[PDB]
Design a protein around this ligand. Sequence first.
Ligand SMILES: Nc1ncnc2c1ncn2[C@@H]1O[C@H](COP(=O)(O)O)[C@@H](O)[C@H]1O
Ligand SMILES: Nc1ncnc2c1ncn2[C@@H]1O[C@H](COP(=O)(O)O)[C@@H](O)[C@H]1O
Ligand SMILES: Nc1ncnc2c1ncn2[C@@H]1O[C@H](COP(=O)(O)O)[C@@H](O)[C@H]1O
Ligand SMILES: Nc1ncnc2c1ncn2[C@@H]1O[C@H](COP(=O)(O)O)[C@@H](O)[C@H]1O
Ligand SMILES: [Mg+2]
Ligand SMILES: [Mg+2]
Ligand SMILES: [Mg+2]
Lengths: 310, 310
Amino acid sequence: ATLICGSIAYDNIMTFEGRFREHILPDQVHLINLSFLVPTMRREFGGCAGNIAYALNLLGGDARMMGTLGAVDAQPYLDRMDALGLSREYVRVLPDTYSAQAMITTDLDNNQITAFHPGAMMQSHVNHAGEAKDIKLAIVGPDGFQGMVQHTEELAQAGVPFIFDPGQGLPLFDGATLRRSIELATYIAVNDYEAKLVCDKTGWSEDEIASRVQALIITRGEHGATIRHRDGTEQIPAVRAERVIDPTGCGDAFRGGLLYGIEHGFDWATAGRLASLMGALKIAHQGPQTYAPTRAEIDARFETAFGYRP
Amino acid sequence: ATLICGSIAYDNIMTFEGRFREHILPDQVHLINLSFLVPTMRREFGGCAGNIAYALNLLGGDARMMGTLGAVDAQPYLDRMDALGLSREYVRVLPDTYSAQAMITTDLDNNQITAFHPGAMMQSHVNHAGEAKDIKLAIVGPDGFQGMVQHTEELAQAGVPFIFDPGQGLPLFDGATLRRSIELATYIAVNDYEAKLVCDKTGWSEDEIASRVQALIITRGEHGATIRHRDGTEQIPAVRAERVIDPTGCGDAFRGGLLYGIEHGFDWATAGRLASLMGALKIAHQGPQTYAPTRAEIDARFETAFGYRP
Ligand SMILES: Nc1ncnc2c1ncn2[C@@H]1O[C@H](COP(=O)(O)O)[C@@H](O)[C@H]1O
Ligand SMILES: Nc1ncnc2c1ncn2[C@@H]1O[C@H](COP(=O)(O)O)[C@@H](O)[C@H]1O
Ligand SMILES: Nc1ncnc2c1ncn2[C@@H]1O[C@H](COP(=O)(O)O)[C@@H](O)[C@H]1O
Ligand SMILES: Nc1ncnc2c1ncn2[C@@H]1O[C@H](COP(=O)(O)O)[C@@H](O)[C@H]1O
Ligand SMILES: [Mg+2]
Ligand SMILES: [Mg+2]
Ligand SMILES: [Mg+2]
């Protein structure tokens, strides 16, 4: 039983089939102008807690989402949760407010620029992580600020180890509130851009961050991930992608892997290789939760890549 | 009379209250992550022909829109065209189709990253600029590719001087078709990022392009603009904006200025100055056509900025 704290949201995703990096011109006053053709809209199921629970559930883990929806557009997400066998124990639905929505425009480098309507996520703190029953592991992901803070406080007071993924909630934090949460965290899992943002805001070095947690994990897209102890660092490979369609959700799939790895007491290598696999399988499909491998399929792909079953 | 060829669209603009240039980290695998709070939506009147005609009309010029709207949602745009006094004679409405709609993610530097669902714009070639009566000046702006090429061809054979502003539709062109259109154009106006993209694609230098046209106009956001014209070069100052809310549509406001000036026989310095003023006026509001200065105020602001009346 793994408590999954984070946004539950509707995503509207616009993926440039290319890399923003190729189209930056520093020398101009206009740094980048792009206009790319896209077909009909399709609203996706997303949010950080949503994505992480999905990935964990794909692996055959027990995933308890803790987060907030709004009653006006809740049902299609609640029904999906029901159809998938995801518990709504800590999924709170608030009468007469809208659920979070993310307008995400991105490229194949996962440079997500999101216009975010927090909606019901502004109330995330109505859930109390401490109250959760028989939790073995948790993750605290991007969410309402008061929610993120509270979740870290209650889980550390409960001695429930958690991964802390501030991700897209970093702007809500300051030096003092980011340091506090990182002090309460068992693991920190960020992408390399977020690590630098964290380094800046905390005024801490990576060395100083790694000293305070059990593991510092930094994902770097197609270049894999780093799993840092204070006594060692595993270099995690990227599983070469069948094809690259949409990286939106890759962070969250990877954390699906991590959470499974940790709760089963995998070695750090195997934990990260499994996380990295989830990352590679997602990127081949449009949206955070459009991939749907079977666990036998995940298992087969893992043994092909690495020569053993997880 | 002035023919304005280009898109008619509804704009959904997500302006970062900031500048992307400040959040880029090149030394990282992920160049930029952002996730910024937005108010709820507001479907704006937009599209390049829609924007240009609007600006010209505010100036009391005669603006004939040539574009294609979708019958499913064309009425609101058409009714407002009515309200504003904009002729609908070449605004062709395609039965059972959607109007073009843009999702524009931007910043205060006008770094537009746009996902564009063209719909009825894909049919823009149904309009034949050769058939437009009593036109003495034209502009061919971003539109469906067949439509853009056609206008360029048909205007040149009709002997209508025109500004070619290919802007967002550059990816549709190749070296040959772009060199063809510049050859047919009397004037070119683009932003500075576009100017370098045109150079790259045509293989022509900026000196070589200016040789083939009566004027090459290069806009530079807050830096103003340049007008290269055979027998001289003007460096148009920016009119310091009241406030900088949304630059989306600034290019198109500017082109309205230019088109009014050319038709009314201003010199390049004065026409570029009214161009600069129209963009300064627009930037003080959200969206491309929100701004509604009277001719009196345009007259007042011009003199305040420049010390005379054109
Ligand atoms: N400011 C935010 N707070 C919470 N969640 C967000 C925010 N911005 C985007 N998201 C969610 O972030 C998810 C993508 O994260 P990732 O899995 O790291 O690619 C999407 O499913 C969005 O719903
Ligand atoms: N282009 C890619 N190819 C293979 N795996 C990827 C790619 N992008 C992301 N991933 C996987 O997903 C993880 C998270 O991606 P990111 O959030 O973009 O750092 C990475 O560390 C990889 O394991
Ligand atoms: N690919 C495209 N084709 C035609 N028009 C576009 C495209 N992308 C954006 N636009 C329009 O361009 C306008 C903004 O251009 P600008 O006036 O140069 O800032 C908006 O009103 C959009 O509707
Ligand atoms: N921040 C700004 N302040 C004042 N004027 C501006 C600003 N941005 C754009 N303009 C005007 O609008 C024109 C077109 O802008 P752009 O399409 O960004 O090159 C510029 O040449 C300026 O004259
Ligand atoms: Mg992430
Ligand atoms: Mg010529
Ligand atoms: Mg433009």
